[PDB]
Amino acid sequence: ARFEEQKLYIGGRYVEASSGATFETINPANGEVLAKVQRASREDVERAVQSAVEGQKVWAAMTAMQRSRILRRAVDILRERNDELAALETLDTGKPLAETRSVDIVTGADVLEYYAGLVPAIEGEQIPLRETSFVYTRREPLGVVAGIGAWNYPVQIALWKSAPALAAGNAMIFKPSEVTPLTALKLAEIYTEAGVPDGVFNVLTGSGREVGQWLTEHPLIEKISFTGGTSTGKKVMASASSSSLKEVTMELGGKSPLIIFPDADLDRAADIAVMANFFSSGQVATNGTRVFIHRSQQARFEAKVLERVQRIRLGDPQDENTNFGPLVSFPHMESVLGYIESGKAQKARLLCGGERVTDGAFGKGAYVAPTVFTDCRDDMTIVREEIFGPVMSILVYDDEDEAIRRANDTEYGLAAGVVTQDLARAHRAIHRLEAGICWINTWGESPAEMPVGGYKQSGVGRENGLTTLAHYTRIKSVQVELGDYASVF
Amino acid sequence: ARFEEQKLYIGGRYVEASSGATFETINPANGEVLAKVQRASREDVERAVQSAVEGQKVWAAMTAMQRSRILRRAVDILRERNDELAALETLDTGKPLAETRSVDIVTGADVLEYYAGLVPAIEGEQIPLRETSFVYTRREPLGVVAGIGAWNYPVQIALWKSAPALAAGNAMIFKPSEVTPLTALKLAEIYTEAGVPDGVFNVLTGSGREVGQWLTEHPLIEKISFTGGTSTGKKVMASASSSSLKEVTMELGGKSPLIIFPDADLDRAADIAVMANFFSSGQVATNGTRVFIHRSQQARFEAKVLERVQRIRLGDPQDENTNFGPLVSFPHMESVLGYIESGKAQKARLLCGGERVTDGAFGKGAYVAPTVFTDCRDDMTIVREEIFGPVMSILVYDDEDEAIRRANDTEYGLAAGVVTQDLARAHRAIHRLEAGICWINTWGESPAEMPVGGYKQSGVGRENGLTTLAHYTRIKSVQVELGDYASVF
Amino acid sequence: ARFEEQKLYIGGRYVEASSGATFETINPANGEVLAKVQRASREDVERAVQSAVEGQKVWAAMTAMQRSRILRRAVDILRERNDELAALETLDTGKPLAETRSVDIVTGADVLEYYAGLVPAIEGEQIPLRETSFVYTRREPLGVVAGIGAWNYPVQIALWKSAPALAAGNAMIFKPSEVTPLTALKLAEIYTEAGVPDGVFNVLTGSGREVGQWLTEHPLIEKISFTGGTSTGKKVMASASSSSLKEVTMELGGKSPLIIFPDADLDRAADIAVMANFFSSGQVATNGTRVFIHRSQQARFEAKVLERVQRIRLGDPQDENTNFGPLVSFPHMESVLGYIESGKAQKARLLCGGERVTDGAFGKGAYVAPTVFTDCRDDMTIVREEIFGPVMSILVYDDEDEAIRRANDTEYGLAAGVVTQDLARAHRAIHRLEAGICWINTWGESPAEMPVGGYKQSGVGRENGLTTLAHYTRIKSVQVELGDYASVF
Amino acid sequence: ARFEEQKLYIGGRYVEASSGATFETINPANGEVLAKVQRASREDVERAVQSAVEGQKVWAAMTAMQRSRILRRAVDILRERNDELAALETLDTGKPLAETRSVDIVTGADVLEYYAGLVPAIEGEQIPLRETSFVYTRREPLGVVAGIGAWNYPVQIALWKSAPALAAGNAMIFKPSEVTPLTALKLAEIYTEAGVPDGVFNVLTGSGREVGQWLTEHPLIEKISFTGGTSTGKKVMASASSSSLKEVTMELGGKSPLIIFPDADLDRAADIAVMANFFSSGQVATNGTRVFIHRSQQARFEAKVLERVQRIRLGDPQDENTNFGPLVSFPHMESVLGYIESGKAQKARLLCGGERVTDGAFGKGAYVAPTVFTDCRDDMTIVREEIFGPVMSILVYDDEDEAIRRANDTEYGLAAGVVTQDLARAHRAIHRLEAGICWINTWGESPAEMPVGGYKQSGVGRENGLTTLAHYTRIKSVQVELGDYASVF
Numbered sequence A, B, C, D: 001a002r003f004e005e006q007k008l009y010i011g012g013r014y015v016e017a018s019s020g021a022t023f024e025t026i027n028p029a030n031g032e033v034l035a036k037v038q039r040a041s042r043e044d045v046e047r048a049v050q051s052a053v054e055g056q057k058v059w060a061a062m063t064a065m066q067r068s069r070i071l072r073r074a075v076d077i078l079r080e081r082n083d084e085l086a087a088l089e090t091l092d093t094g095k096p097l098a099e100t101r102s103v104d105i106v107t108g109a110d111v112l113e114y115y116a117g118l119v120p121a122i123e124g125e126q127i128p129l130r131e132t133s134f135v136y137t138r139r140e141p142l143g144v145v146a147g148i149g150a151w152n153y154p155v156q157i158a159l160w161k162s163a164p165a166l167a168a169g170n171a172m173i174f175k176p177s178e179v180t181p182l183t184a185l186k187l188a189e190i191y192t193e194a195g196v197p198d199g200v201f202n203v204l205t206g207s208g209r210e211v212g213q214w215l216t217e218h219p220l221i222e223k224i225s226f227t228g229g230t231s232t233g234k235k236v237m238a239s240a241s242s243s244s245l246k247e248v249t250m251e252l253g254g255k256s257p258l259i260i261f262p263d264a265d266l267d268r269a270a271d272i273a274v275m276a277n278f279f280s281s282g283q284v285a286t287n288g289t290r291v292f293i294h295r296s297q298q299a300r301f302e303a304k305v306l307e308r309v310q311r312i313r314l315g316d317p318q319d320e321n322t323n324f325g326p327l328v329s330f331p332h333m334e335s336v337l338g339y340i341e342s343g344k345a346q347k348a349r350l351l352c353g354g355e356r357v358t359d360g361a362f363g364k365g366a367y368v369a370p371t372v373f374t375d376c377r378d379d380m381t382i383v384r385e386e387i388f389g390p391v392m393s394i395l396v397y398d399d400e401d402e403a404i405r406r407a408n409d410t411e412y413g414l415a416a417g418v419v420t421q422d423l424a425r426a427h428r429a430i431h432r433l434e435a436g437i438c439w440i441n442t443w444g445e446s447p448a449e450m451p452v453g454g455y456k457q458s459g460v461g462r463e464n465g466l467t468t469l470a471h472y473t474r475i476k477s478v479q480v481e482l483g484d485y486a487s488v489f
């Protein structure tokens, strides 16, 4: 393998798993093996939890500013090592070096940086009741929490989950996707290097149906934060609930609507549509995979998108000039391809791509071409279901109300967007679109200040923003009685 | 039956259930049949959801102050009908008039009144990103939510759940306990009469394993708030998650510790202990059912408790002089009597009570004497397990840390309290107790301002206070882009 | 005199002033003497102060919800007496009944209602320092505060000032303008009737030459809230500061810019401009008295402005059909005509009005015509100075940065507003305008939720919204030390 | 002159004053002349203001995080140069190195570090009004603000004032005390080196009567924050107000009460009493200069105080073993000595100290001994007036209510504290004390998170805590109208 065997990270160091099993992570750009990775056993989960229980006590016993300084140090390291971490992430995800070098770690560290600064700002409340009595609340750490990551943005997700958790005074046990375990272990080394006490950020590798579930079930873990498919989320949330009533955050899937109004600049709109569909090779949960265009503009719009799509630079992720990589895994390419086939079979009109790219060494990698379907109907499987691949579904509408209604006609509610230049229409439409993450005349930016998460079946809770920090603490209310105590007995 | 048949309440009026079935509700003081009550069918649930969906739109379209005035009027009617409502709650629960007249509606209304005032105060945030882009959040209503109530404070629970839901622009479908459906239907009448749009507060009667589960499963219901046992909550929450990823609030069971430190006034400590065990015949979730007393004060404390217990006025709940009534039902009595038998069998010393009271008219009802066990030990069933009846367990300890360790040694974590005259000990101890609701030198008061709920397996989320109101809304983040849009493609 | 002699209001009743002096208030519509009004002596100020001190204790000893209910009862009485109070304010101000009936008391009560509901939401903070120490803050009432009202919205301003003051648990001594003293006395009666304790809202009649001055100087008064001219504000604040270090809030004057951009609907823009200029006969501090129109539209704009002005229904304020009344007083009419003179003298083109209206009955009142100057220039006295009367100055501009730069070129900064259909321009422009109150495509609406107040020399502090309530309490920080104390000596 | 001549700091470098004048800063330990310092001329003030104006635009043009990173950079530099700055402050103030090394820069930087993390957290609000309209608020920088420093903690004060000002996106012009100009100039360098844009922090030296007043009078400065005597603050505030309605912060004098209740541990009480009187040689505004002791404990308490005072190590500020330095100047020393004489004159019993220390090298410095007066009376000049030197007045009392009434009986109200082991007394007593800064069983600690400032004549506004950052922005409300506009005309 390219790298030595990846071990478990528990208590500020690597330790041997006790499962006697490993799995491989595969570079999707060429099918080669990057590393063999240990599977955590049930007893390894138990070792990580006790490690965290004790680590958390040390972390919590420090002052607010002590925690803040340690996390700012981690940020400093992440900045130093941005390129190196981006390179590792490219190997593990297949994503273009152009994306990983400027996005994954940058915005990951951005969020940690944001929370690091907010540690001393976590406050409770005080409420006078009467002269002889008052209450004050404390916002205590939950204790030991667990994050479970997806494969599309491995270290970013690991940072967005562990940043608020740790900033709130908690220990997090983290499980990356089997598909992409590498950068998570690197983060753990970095946290330790920065001063994060042993046990406070532990990483367990393995499958979700094993270690994932062992985590969601463990009695001592107070909260699960999960990122992945709506279908899987439902199972994960059910188990966190029924085992010990854990608190939960769920960041799930979507089929996010982009509505392009007639008064939009069809150039900006096309840029937004492609960006909302083809960045990270279509592997972004918030993607605007249902694009609504007015009938009077379909033709023109279809022409601008095509022109754009044709200049997309598919190629080796290692190539600085590549801005569109292979998909993350071969089985996922197979899934995506299935969808594109469904499209064809359902008489959706193909506008571009529509097939695997095999020319040359591309055949050794999991490449799918940027694909666009148009003349779509709301009942087509490619329009109802999340593909999580490079597949845009263009849809035609006749009036604003009809478009909003259709945009909302889904069990998903992750993101939504409008392109218009009219003041009233921008706000009017956005207020009516049933999604947690809404964009006006843009797409995809996710500032650390902005709470993001889904409506309906796209999630529970939120990540980022001031609100997310509070949701990593538990409220304790204390009534102080200074006066006499009355009894009816 | 005493009263005419009780029907469903949907869309501002009573409607016929479509199940073909009914159940009876019983006065536990004398076993009298109070009413035949209809069982909501699966299709009745659908009817109620569609009613709520449409009513919620009417309610949300009003202005903040319009909603506030309507809720305040509902508060006004409650004050008028306090006594009438108390009389009804007494019949249905067995709780003394002296409690229902001064606690249940008073404090149910206190919370509605609190939230009525805060409707106009619900706000989102605004964050500048750069000269050319900012974000604002909206706190939008969830839509339709479900409340599932418990039998011990039937109307107060419907109010504590319906107030924040309605104040935040939601509609709520409420299912009272099959054991005590009567006052919840009255609340629904009062809401309608106050101006609450039809469909905004609907009441469905029946069983939890049926109508409750149909509620937790329904895909158009965005949130469940549940009050009941920990075992039940785990099921409810699994159901709410697996079905459609609902938001959840859970107010569950407890085995809350009361630590009486050696510098306590033992008269106050005995008053506190008795109030924390025998109010509402011991049927209060936050009851301090494990009372820790220092070895050196055991005998004196016991004598004080005994003296107070002996003067407790067990009797007919319609008699104003009664301050201790029957349990809620015959099957709950049998449950409590079994716990009592467990305590005798495991060699706890019986300080007083310990049996059913059947003398005179009491034979017709479910009366269990206020009971005190002492010389208890941590491993005893009566100490480990929530009894939810008038059974106090006294436990001797030798030092402060020992007491705190034992107080914390439980899967519960609803409430906790200390009695001490020492400034440092008071706060030191409370800060280390793993419970959501903490009392110093008092017990039982639950101000509308004070967020209440459980640590650990005693709950998920909170009720009352500013924070709770927020958890009845969903965050929408809206990014406005005022400048150019950049595409990498 | 139409009414009997008006007395001081101290301690829940009318009492005789001790000055031996009275002033008259005049109906500006017909010159009728409405009433003689006693002027407070210095000794009367002292008496009002002691009353407020003892009253405030009683008010503050209540529970939050207790204060809330009393303020809500005052709100109910105000709604009952809306028309009656409107009639009286119409007599005293000359403002049209069509205004006083739908605006003054309505929005006055709106704010009191809003604050009524927020009383129980006033909270402090809690902050853990370390295991052995934490801090909590209390928000304590200031004590006795002073309100100084203006003559353009007498009862509304009295409401907007006393509502947050009383809601935060203070007592207020209020001084209405000598010009409009009548309704403030009525509000005092109402508060008493609603349950406001004696002394908590005392009214002292007199002028800024005597009583106003005694209040700002009083050692025992903790805060001054002032509405009036920037010039008077500077004196008031100086006196308030140097005398005893008072908190001050000041709502002062303006010369607010209204920028019509080239893409604006001119019908709306004209609607906006006339409203922004002639409501309450131009007697509104936030009036958009500098209207920027693009050279290309100057012609079409003036036409629509002129068409609207000409249909203004100047007339007797007691006629429901009137929508434009006389000015508040003859001395203020003289001031306004003075400015109209200046505009003529300085060669500004007079589009309409420009003169005292004297036809028939109007000759006995203080009517001035809706006046529009155009072709104005930035150095014109009418363009730089606040007229506070029905006088719109239209300014031509060429480009967007120019209009903004010019809108900003003033020592004022109360309001500003833009008219445009463009999403980007609307926000981009408003963010650059240096005013505390900014309108997009509308004017004048001042929602209870919306903090209002001035940039630069247009004010200090704010009125309305959540933030304002906080400024009627002082912060006390409490550090609790539970651990050891360390000394270097 | 130990150092070269000190120039004005403007626009990122030292520049020449245009006054032609200078003053000397002394060293109170030896009389040495540390430097000559140029007086800023009225035109220099004009210069600093225009520099500030342009710098602010640069600062504000950055992102929140960029600003954050720069202030964190500054913090790092301060930690490095902690000892070196300490040594300089020790020369310019006379305070023991033992203090300056561990307090002045440490806690100065603490506050900067705190606010650096909070820059991104500054947010406005969003308020829906109806389907067609909503408002949002922006918290914009004030612009240019001024700080006027005091001489007891020169660099800490400059940090506490500029930290929030800069974090909120303002430029500050700071004027050190003539008595202690050195460290302020060093901080200006440090900021510039950290990356703070030119103009954002400028230092002008000279008199308050002149340059102080020129700053408070300037029409382009938006706010003044001042620290010094109540007498002067009143003047300063009047000027800031009468000139242009500037927002103001005033941290002023006090005569803070310390109440030792009869259950207090006397050792802890004596330690607190001495820390509260003799740290920084008694030159701290929040000092407990009036110590109330119960009659029953007076003798034992005085004894314990004496024992501690006798072992105080007065000596050379340069020596590491000194914990009690000379006063800040010979003039200030005379003032203190005057007070000390008044005390002798009025027959207070001198427990110890009460004269200058002249033995040896001490005669070359402004050394007053640690002085304790006992048997004081409330009307003594030493009890009524702030001495600002090493003088403790001990006051006997008989009961709690008395002690609280006497504690409150003063026009000051900066700080207060109690010593007691009783939970109820501690909170009850503190709630009744009219001071902004209250300590329980401790004294002196001032967490970055804790808002600190005075009641009554001890101040206006606060320093530190979340609240202070907010008062360095101004609120703009924006109403967005998305529907029709209605005109009565």
Ligand SMILES: NC(=O)C1=CN([C@@H]2O[C@H](COP(=O)(O)OP(=O)(O)OC[C@H]3O[C@@H](n4cnc5c(N)ncnc54)[C@H](OP(=O)(O)O)[C@@H]3O)[C@@H](O)[C@H]2O)C=CC1
Residues within 6 Å of the ligand: A148, A149, A150, A151, A152, A175, A176, A177, A178, A179, A206, A207, A208, A209, A212, A213, A216, A227, A228, A229, A230, A232, A233, A235, A236, A251, A252, A253, A254, A285, A335, A386, A387, A388
């Ligand atoms: N919206 C998003 O962010 C993502 C959505 N998806 C959607 O999911 C589909 C399949 O991708 P897939 O790889 O299956 O992603 P999943 O959603 O199945 O998995 C996400 C994460 O959850 C873990 N997990 C999987 N099953 C369980 C379980 N039973 N209990 C606890 N944890 C579990 C996984 O571990 P492991 O997989 O290592 O076994 C992984 O870490 C895709 O088509 C895509 O549409 C997928 C990934 C991210």
Ligand SMILES: [K+]
Residues within 6 Å of the ligand: A025, A026, A027, A028, A091, A092, A093, A179, A180, A328
């Ligand atoms: K991989």
Ligand SMILES: [K+]
Residues within 6 Å of the ligand: A454, A455, A456, A457, A458, A459, A460, B245, B246, B247
């Ligand atoms: K959800």
Ligand SMILES: [K+]
Residues within 6 Å of the ligand: B025, B026, B027, B028, B091, B092, B093, B179, B180, B328
């Ligand atoms: K019943």
Ligand SMILES: [K+]
Residues within 6 Å of the ligand: A244, A245, A246, A247, B454, B455, B456, B457, B458, B459, B460
């Ligand atoms: K829980």
Ligand SMILES: [K+]
Residues within 6 Å of the ligand: C025, C026, C027, C028, C091, C092, C093, C179, C180, C328
């Ligand atoms: K008048």
Ligand SMILES: [K+]
Residues within 6 Å of the ligand: C454, C455, C456, C457, C458, C459, C460, D244, D245, D246, D247
């Ligand atoms: K101002």
Ligand SMILES: [K+]
Residues within 6 Å of the ligand: D025, D026, D027, D028, D091, D092, D093, D179, D180, D328, D329
């Ligand atoms: K000096």
Ligand SMILES: [K+]
Residues within 6 Å of the ligand: C222, C244, C245, C246, C247, D455, D456, D457, D459, D460
């Ligand atoms: K003050």
